[PDB]
Write a protein that binds this ligand. Structure first.
Ligand SMILES: N=C(N)NC[C@@H](O)CC(=O)C(=O)O
Ligand SMILES: [Cl-]
Lengths: 369, 353
């Protein structure tokens, strides 16, 4: 009855022990609270300055924070959207104008697949081992109009390394294929902070990148998706963007600018240490629980998969919920073969440590019948 | 300056500035309380402010979207599997036509005098899967009266047709504050209403579209909504709640007087100019059409742009027959009175030369 992962996440939104959706819900740091305290000043700034200047500063702050120095800074090359999923809707409807089939990393966050399928795109799954480990086949590339990679991936944290991004972009250029990247989790893993735009521009393929500010910081879902495209993208992303929105709030762009600057001043290192700490409490709690393992030992992302022998993630979820703890079954990240995720759940790490600790102690008991 | 887009850009009232000064408190509330409570309170405040007492208050029946256009994208995509043709009021907000067409729907225009003045024909209704009405209409301000909404809903029920309403301008016109949901539920057609908080108040485009649907809508609106978002920011919902409460305490009356004053400024400025008329004398909406014989709205737009004034030509609103609008421009009234007056003074000079 839960048609997708988001519908599993609705069930948790109002619970104290929500460890389901991946949004950031931990406490603000002192530096971030200082930003919140200045919201009336930022409001006045947003009333008084041209939105284009605030937007340009927000983009410069966010891209540079995360190593993306070669981003196209000319006005109009970065389209600020209400969310990364709104960017994805724009991209999907734009692709449907000239593309029939898309190669998509599998597993990945399921709304990517659902927005593409919903706009009439046929999907070809590419497992992570194939994507990272070998060139894509000429047969595949000649059969799709777009290759779509989430990096760092959600839910696995796997990062597309620079040498493979380079080869994939060269392959897409050689075939005339669009290379599309979803980089929502970029800020969590320094392995993703090499300059992706330099790689894409050097290879000269058609490309689109959807950045997302929303997952990094606890901003009450005040965020933007940033839809960045090559000059030769040859899809109607600008026209469809303008059918959906004029732009995002200057106050949100001002907030992104300020949170990005705080992150550059030491906040990002603190965030990495916080996520590492919370990952450690999860793994320590589910330590010698017979049948438990962690499929992504090297992940640095803000979500964590846990596997179990002998039960399904749906059953674990239901016993958890009877204790008012809400996690996420993994089936639906495996959008081409949901049974691949039948023995995993996903835990959200962007949470205050104390309710996270409480939730995984409950999971430890459940997982011990 | 900008008298083009319809968004609210006037200064905050003192009551609204107090809300903004307390944003850090609203932030703490949004961290601490269940979003569902904040959302229910925001919906209750907004629907009750505007007379919509019968709205479905059960959680999940009102879907909070980033914007009304996001709601419209959801609706357009949701229609596309089962509906080939949509009857759409003409003229209207051109984004609605472009979102419907972009999702594969063919459009049939319904002129305003036909929509308001008589029942729709069986031929039309049996040939479309959805009838879409913007009320109060943008750009004309024309309000669908209760008796006509009831008949239109009854006719859509009789023909198995979805009735969809876009009510973004609702807050500006008390004629649109009769309870639309009571009518829709009593008629028993499949229906969707897209409310919008965005155009009423100068909130720096912090807003929500509210996608409301009948239990039997029979379209994948909930599924496609969940493909796009988990929900809107609790801070924005809290802001909507507070601005709605301020409006209920006298702010809405002040807004109506402010819009009336700015409408009066525009008309007094242009009253005597040869060839100028106002096609919508009873409109209370936050945009104003100005008609003028002798020039095209495109030519007038061009001339204003030379003097650094940005209005809108009306062609685009006549999405089925753009020439229907090339003797009109549209002026935005949700502006501080001083820059509006400056803009209209340039327009008067342009029209007198
Ligand atoms: N359809 C959408 N947009 N769902 C919300 C999204 O933020 C969930 C997600 O990606 C996660 O929990 O990791
Ligand atoms: Cl408008």
């Amino acid at each position: 009855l839960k048609e997708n992962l988001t519908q599993w996440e609705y069930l948790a939104l109002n619970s104290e022990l929500n460890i389901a959706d991946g949004h950031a819900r931990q406490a603000l740091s002192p530096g971030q609270q200082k930003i919140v305290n200045e919201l009336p000043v930022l409001w006045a700034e947003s009333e008084q300055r041209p939105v284009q200047q605030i937007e340009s500063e927000a983009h410069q702050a966010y891209f540079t924070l995360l190593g993306q120095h070669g981003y196209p800074a000319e006005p109009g090359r970065v389209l600020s959207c209400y969310s990364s999923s709104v960017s994805m809707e724009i991209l999907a409807r734009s692709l449907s104008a000239s593309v029939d089939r898309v190669a998509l990393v599998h597993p990945t966050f399921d709304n990517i697949a659902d927005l593409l399928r919903g706009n009439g795109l046929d999907l070809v799954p590419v497992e992570e081992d194939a994507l990272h480990g070998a060139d894509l086949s000429a047969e595949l590339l000649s059969s799709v109009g777009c290759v779509f990679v989430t990096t760092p991936n959600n839910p696995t944290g796997r990062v597309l390394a620079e040498e493979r991004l380079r080869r994939l972009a060269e392959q897409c250029a050689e075939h005339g294929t669009v290379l599309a990247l979803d980089t929502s989790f970029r800020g969590f893993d320094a392995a993703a902070h090499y300059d992706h735009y330099a790689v894409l521009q050097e290879a000269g393929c058609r490309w689109v990148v959807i950045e997302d500010t929303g997952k990094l910081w606890p901003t009450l879902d005040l965020k933007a998706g940033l839809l960045v495209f090559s000059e030769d993208i040859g899809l109607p992303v600008e026209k469809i963007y303008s059918d959906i929105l004029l732009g995002v709030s200057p106050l949100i762009l001002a907030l992104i600018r300020e949170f990005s600057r705080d992150a550059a001043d030491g906040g990002l290192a603190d965030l990495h240490a916080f996520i590492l700490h919370n990952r450690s409490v999860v793994r320590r709690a589910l330590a010698g629980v017979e049948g438990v393992s962690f499929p992504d030992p090297e992940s640095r992302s803000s979500v964590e998969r846990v596997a179990f022998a002998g039960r399904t993630g749906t059953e674990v979820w239901e016993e958890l919920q009877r204790h008012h703890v809400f996690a996420l079954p993994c089936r639906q990240f495996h959008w081409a073969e949901p049974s691949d995720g039948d023995h995993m759940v996903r835990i959200a790490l962007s949470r205050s440590t104390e309710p996270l600790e409480k939730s995984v102690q409950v999971l430890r008991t459940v997982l011990e019948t």
